[PDB]
Design a binder for this molecule. Structure first.
Ligand code: SF4
Ligand code: SF4
Ligand code: FCO
Ligand code: FCO
Ligand code: SF3
Ligand code: SF3
Ligand code: F3S
Ligand code: F3S
Ligand SMILES: [Cl-]
Ligand SMILES: [Cl-]
Ligand SMILES: [Cl-]
Ligand SMILES: [Cl-]
Ligand SMILES: [Mg+2]
Ligand SMILES: [Mg+2]
Ligand code: NI
Ligand code: NI
Lengths: 581, 264, 581, 264
């Protein structure tokens, strides 16, 4: 065994080795390994992406106008965000400006995705780490109604309702066909909710599973379908006609009325179900404000998102702020430049890829995707990994760094950047939230804090949906209907050689696509995705990524039941298909 | 009264078919899970992870040998000895073969499981291969699309449960009920196709009246699916209704049939 | 003035005359006049239909296959029931037998309309006679939550929900634009609910206004649209294809799944919202179990409905029983024959029509619709009526009688007939309802009882929806798909001269269409509709109809405010376009 | 902030247009009444009756003279001195004229108010007459259909409130947005019409595959409405989708154009 120091941690692979493969309640394929010491505390953590498809290789030779459709299929959970980054990148390369209504509709698509993705993660993916579903069978329905009514104005709170939910769960379990609840961690000592809170949370799990289907009807109106809506280089394909013959063939007042109805329902669900449940998880699990900090008190990154001035990606336009903090210095939020070769770079010395020199990092315009499965000695064989070798190559995920620093991305990172840049709405919301929990500001830099920030962002995004809809309606009242620019649709109008960057903030964090066009075709297409940052393996200096750092130093009650590992990983909302592409 | 056991596995994929399933409007996915089937293994939704998830997999396929339905999302890669997709330290294909051996029937959800989809597009770096080229001794129902329509997925499940039989299929293994006719043979813009009334550039006057998308590259004339009839997201829209031509996403090899914007 | 005796009443038109014109919260046009004595008790009541269109005239010379579409437009509230009676009548004339699935789907159409019609009447038409909307502003939201939870398992009951509903009402009235609430009867002494029951009821009025739109999606699947779905002579046009190519062009598994989802939601709303609200109205208004009896303890009529054996309209097939009671003898339920010329007859001595002899009644196969506007010696003039003359012709509604007896039809009539024939489900439901109220069985023969029976019937019909759906699915599982018989579609296949009767139970009561075909065309088409019975004018013996009888002997607190008159009239659910056609 | 006053009156009618309005899915009719307009008179829904209802009518048309929208459902009969339709003891036509004189604009809901509908079909016993043959000095927007589509009715209302103007109309006074194109020019069965693929008798093999209804009498080729695009009841269906040809119910005189089952 060996030991070394990095980022304030002591990385020590002595002691018992634990393997968690598969990680479930994520998108795609992940393996995690840890070592624990004689006090059952993690002293080493290893993050491994266990899939690869090769979209960067498949994109070569495609028409730039088609690229969005291919890269959308990087992921079905964050559906649409890669299409948005793609049309941004191709428009940046060729020199295309879209009409205002197209930009507003793209911002509606992105806010809709934030609302949907954050809600489904909270209940269906992370929820069962915090709610003991089987303990709900012990709850008193009248005390459940009293708890729910103390927390919210939400209508669905009667004692008879909670009895009916409880009885449905009882009938489901009684024959032994426990389905998704089989062989779970129920009864673990880290489940701290009282029975009434478990029954409230389970009822809400079911309500959210039903309601999430309605949110994406906004994507169906403007984008045809969800999952995987349609887009175009130059704007959007959903032509508008309010008051002329043939409005039945276009986005008309009836279609707009449908969108408004969904916005209102989405805000009400988030504000009166999700928000109070997040605060209740905080009230009953306060010690988790001190677990899983990782890189969140050291290095955090946002590119920024939601340009409110069409075709302007600068600081005065982006409604979601960008910036970087390193070395724990939150008093100096630094500007990010995605063209600068000294800023974003990816390393592969600990990943299953070939570079001519694996000791250096490559900016994405110099990127290489040459797969090389080479696990070394894994205590089995090349087709039987018993223990990954983290001294050598151990993942399908490349290692991104910013100025050589390992960064965390996502809701907590964005919240910290906006707070420290002085965004007034963010400061007031965060301060009020931590006051309600009787916790210090530093409590947000934790596994619990990731969950709280995600719920806060769902509320923010639901508010911005209404703002963007109102902006679209103002343009239509003023006779401004345009949804596409076609001046540069034809390849004969493009530069012979050009390159561009498309960037945004996906639900999970900072997203970039780097594209080079030559002779009418894609010459290079490189993606760096939020889970690529967070789930990163090590670099030539031995520096660890966000997941590995957040797991370090964690106590486990029962080594064979990895509930604490699952809680912290799921708090980042891992998307493994995204991370590897 | 016991519910039919279902094992749902995942190869190389983007998870769009699982997301489509949970959008079902009638029956709600909640009611499918609680009352119509026993969804006994599914990586995306299940409580157990790691060793606990491996125990569930082993237990269900042994206890219910010959009696469970296997749902497959995604596909196996043959490159790098299968280690482009790793499950419990071993190639995904090993888990696919063990699950298939005990199944009574297999549902291949989506273009990935049916044909290959985006990872199989040129130059197919991982040698991604559809389910029916690996599993050759079991009934396989293909439900293609990227992803298939939510209420098509749930209608196929309810048909199997209610009628206690597999749907009748075409020569490619697709259910006749939803894949027997082309998009273009039930398209509400066909009047405009027949009259030579076409969109020529985005947001032109023709686009603003809902004219036909053939000259913008629509692949509806060669694509079999239910999008122009059943439609998407509780009947709200479909690709052509919102102004983009069909990409051809239900058909084998659609990524490599030329640009989406070149004519059928 | 004059006085005479009929049916145990003293009809006296001396004293003060009150006029109510228009009657609101009904379908179509009605005028009511009464005389009251110096004790504020009604001693004379006059029912007048104030519209006519002439469908029986318009139908002459039409193709019998088209008739359903014309007669459907008799009414948009009871939409579909006239189309059903029409296809029945034409099939009876020509000798057509429909396939089992067509009969099952027709029974689904009829049960759907009972659910919809009864729900909307309870809240939107009759509700404000019982619920004091402005008094809801004085309720305590917590006390409202406690009341609702004591009465039902329905989920939507939180104190915050009731506060939000109350604040919506408060905002609505704050600008002085009271809309449908302007100049109402609020604060009248006959409003007896406490403030918390008014707020509960008002919340449910809004929930029902929203939910009713969902119920009719069943009509859209099988019939194309609602209002006014489509039908055919020979079955239904909604061809079925479950497992063959082209199922996307037909009623397939996805369409049937939509129907099942609506059935479950409809049952849940009726059983957990409408039923407890009807019982609550009863608990707070028990004196109304002794007001408005009218004909309901004397003479009641049902034709029967919902044939379960396809093409069999006999007693062993009809799920909703038929029969007649006269002379208050509920021990003698008599059989009804719609062909017998001595049973159903219509008189016009007090109506605006011409007969060769106005002192006798005509069976519908001998019916005449020859309009004659002749109001005679009114106070005022023929185009400016101050008082109708009920000693001569006073309505556009003909006067139907059964064996010369004046009858009541509708939910109370049906419930009494089924109870006294010994239908087990009816006996159990009625007994449990009246036990909950601590009222005798005779309490159902009243204005309150008409409301209670309507709620009972909505629950009955929602149960039958599931039964019929399950019957359809059983046939499909057995490979029985047929929905139309076409061997007698072409006119050359019909008898040169034939006649038929189509009958059913509409939401408001007994419905019949009598048709004669000659030489391929309609020769005669006569309709007798439920509100024709109930709103009937007098006959040559001076016998009064159901509305006029139910209003007799009623006390009024305030003569100028007709609340007691409106309560009793609305309890019958008047449909004036139906009554006159 | 005050809402626009609306007076809704009823002549000879079946009340289908009122029922259609309350079916609206987006915005809900509840929200139209509470938040979008001030529905100040309506016989079907109002609390007040008799003398109290007459006082509402008088007070509103006086206080808001020149400022209210008049909605009309049904039509006036000219026969029997107008006493085929009586309100407050006088001919309905007198209430129509008084209401119209104070209105800023008039909406004629349905085929009854627009053209005549079933009571005006041969031999028109009551001499039922459409609104625009009696009121000749006010803007009249015709919204035809028996009844019009629920979400078309609510979209026209939201347009007028949001944009503060009347919809643009064709030469017959119909809103271009929903009545500019024919049913047959946006019908999903048009592929079958163009191929000569027709239903010939009810429930034949063609009917079970969704073939064209032209030979069964469909009047879609001559009918302007939104049924084949917007569809009915929150997009669930329309007449043709459920297997019956269009009757022509949005067009003047549709009852007297021959049998519904005779070809167009
Ligand atoms: S839009 Fe596409 S599917 Fe529709 S008619 Fe045109 S080519 Fe055919
Ligand atoms: S069904 Fe009617 S509207 Fe549709 S294509 Fe055939 S004739 Fe035209
Ligand atoms: N959110 C999201 Fe998916 C990831 N990681 C992307 O981009
Ligand atoms: N119900 C109803 Fe209408 C009436 N009366 C009919 O028939
Ligand atoms: Fe639903 S996993 Fe998404 S890529 Fe095309 S079907 Fe595959
Ligand atoms: Fe809506 S009232 Fe119904 S009949 Fe044809 S529009 Fe008239
Ligand atoms: S792109 Fe796919 S979703 Fe339907 S319309 Fe074409 S088959
Ligand atoms: S009958 Fe009427 S409802 Fe539409 S489809 Fe034809 S215009
Ligand atoms: Cl799997
Ligand atoms: Cl493919
Ligand atoms: Cl009126
Ligand atoms: Cl007409
Ligand atoms: Mg990359
Ligand atoms: Mg009659
Ligand atoms: Ni993803
Ligand atoms: Ni009626």
């Amino acid at each position: 065994s060996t030991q070394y120091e990095t980022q304030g941690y002591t990385i020590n692979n002595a002691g018992r080795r634990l393997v968690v493969d598969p990680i479930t309640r994520i998108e795609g394929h992940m393996r995690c390994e840890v070592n624990i010491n004689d006090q059952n505390v993690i002293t080493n953590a290893v993050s491994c992406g266990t899939m690869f498809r090769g979209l960067e290789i498949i994109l070569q030779g495609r028409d730039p106008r088609d690229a969005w459709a291919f890269v959308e299929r990087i992921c079905g959970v964050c559906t649409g965000v890669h299409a948005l980054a793609s049309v941004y990148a191709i428009e940046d390369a060729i020199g295309i400006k879209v009409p205002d209504n197209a930009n507003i509709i793209r911002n509606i698509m992105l806010a809709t995705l934030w609302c949907h993705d954050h809600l489904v993660h909270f209940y269906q993916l992370a929820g069962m780490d915090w709610i003991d579903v089987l303990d709900a069978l012990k709850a008193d329905p009248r005390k459940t109604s009293e708890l729910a009514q103390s927390l919210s104005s939400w209508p669905k709170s009667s004692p008879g309702y909670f009895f009916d939910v409880q009885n449905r769960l009882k009938k489901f379990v009684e024959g032994g066909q426990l389905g998704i609840f089989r062989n779970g961690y129920w009864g673990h000592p880290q489940y701290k909710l009282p029975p009434e809170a478990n029954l409230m949370g389970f009822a809400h799990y079911l309500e959210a599973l039903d309601f999430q289907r309605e949110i994406v009807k906004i994507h169906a109106v403007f984008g045809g379908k969800n999952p995987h809506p349609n887009w175009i280089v130059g704007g959007m394909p959903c032509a508008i006609n309010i008051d002329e013959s043939g409005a039945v063939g276009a986005v008309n007042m009836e279609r707009l009325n449908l969108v408004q109805s969904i916005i209102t329902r989405t805000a009400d669900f988030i504000n009166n179900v999700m928000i109070p449940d997040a605060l209740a998880i905080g009230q009953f699990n306060k010690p988790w404000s001190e677990i899983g900090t990782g890189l969140s008190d050291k290095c955090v990154l946002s590119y920024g998102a939601f340009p409110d001035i069409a075709n302007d990606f600068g600081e005065k336009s982006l409604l979601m702020p960008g910036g970087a903090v390193i070395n724990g210095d939150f008093n100096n939020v630094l500007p990010v430049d995605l063209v600068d070769p000294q800023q974003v770079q990816e390393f592969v010395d600990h990943a299953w890829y070939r570079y001519p020199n694996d000791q250096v990092g490559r900016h994405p315009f110099d990127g290489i995707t040459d797969p090389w499965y080479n696990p070394g000695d894994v205590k089995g064989s090349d087709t039987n990994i018993q223990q990954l070798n983290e001294q050598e190559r151990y993942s399908w995920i490349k290692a991104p760094r910013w100025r050589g620093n390992a960064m965390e991305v996502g809701p907590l990172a964005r919240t910290l950047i906006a707070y420290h840049k002085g965004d007034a709405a963010t400061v007031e919301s965060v301060d009020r939230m931590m006051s309600a929990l009787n916790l210090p500001l530093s409590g947000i830099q934790s596994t619990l804090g990731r969950i709280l920030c995600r719920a806060h962002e769902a509320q923010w995004a639901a508010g911005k949906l209404q703002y963007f809809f109102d902006k679209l309606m103002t343009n239509l009242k003023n006779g401004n209907l345009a949804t596409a620019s076609t001046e540069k649709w034809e390849p004969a109008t493009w530069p012979t050689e050009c390159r561009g960057v498309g960037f945004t903030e996906a639900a999970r964090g900072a997203l970039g696509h780097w594209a080079a066009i030559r002779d009418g075709k894609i010459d290079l297409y490189q993606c760096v995705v939020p889970t690529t940052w967070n789930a990163s393996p090590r670099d030539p200096k031995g520096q660890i990524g966000a997941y590995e750092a957040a797991l370090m130093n964690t106590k486990m009650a029962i080594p064979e039941q990895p509930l604490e590992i699952l809680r912290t990983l799921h708090s980042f909302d891992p998307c493994l298909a995204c991370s590897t592409h | 009264k016991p519910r039919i056991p279902v094992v749902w596995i995942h190869g190389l994929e983007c998870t769009c078919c699982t997301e489509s399933f949970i959008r079902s409007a009638h029956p709600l996915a909640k009611d499918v899970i609680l009352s119509l089937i026993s969804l006994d293994y599914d990586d995306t939704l299940m409580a157990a992870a790691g060793t606990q998830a491996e125990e569930v997999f082993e237990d269900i396929i042994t206890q219910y040998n010959g009696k469970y339905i296997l749902a497959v999302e995604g596909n196996p890669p043959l490159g790098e000895q299968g280690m482009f997709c790793i499950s419990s330290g071993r190639p995904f294909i090993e888990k696919l073969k063990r699950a298939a051996a005990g199944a009574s029937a297999i549902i291949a959800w989506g273009t990935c499981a049916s044909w290959g989809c985006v990872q199989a597009a040129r130059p197919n770096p991982t040698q991604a291969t559809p389910i029916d080229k690996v599993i050759t001794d079991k009934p396989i129902i293909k439900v293609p699309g990227c992803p298939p329509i939510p209420d098509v997925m749930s209608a196929i499940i309810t048909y199997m449960v209610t009628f206690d039989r597999l749907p009748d299929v075409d020569r490619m293994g697709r259910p006749l009920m939803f894949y027997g006719q082309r998009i273009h043979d039930k398209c509400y813009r066909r009047a405009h196709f027949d009259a030579g009334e076409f969109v020529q550039s985005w947001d032109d006057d023709a686009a603003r009246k809902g004219y036909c998308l053939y000259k913008m590259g629509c692949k509806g004339p060669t694509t079999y699916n239910a999008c122009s009839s059943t439609r998407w997201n509780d009947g709200v829209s479909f690709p052509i209704q919102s102004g983009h031509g069909c990409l051809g996403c239900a058909e084998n090899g659609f990524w490599d049939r030329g640009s989406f914007y070149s004519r059928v």
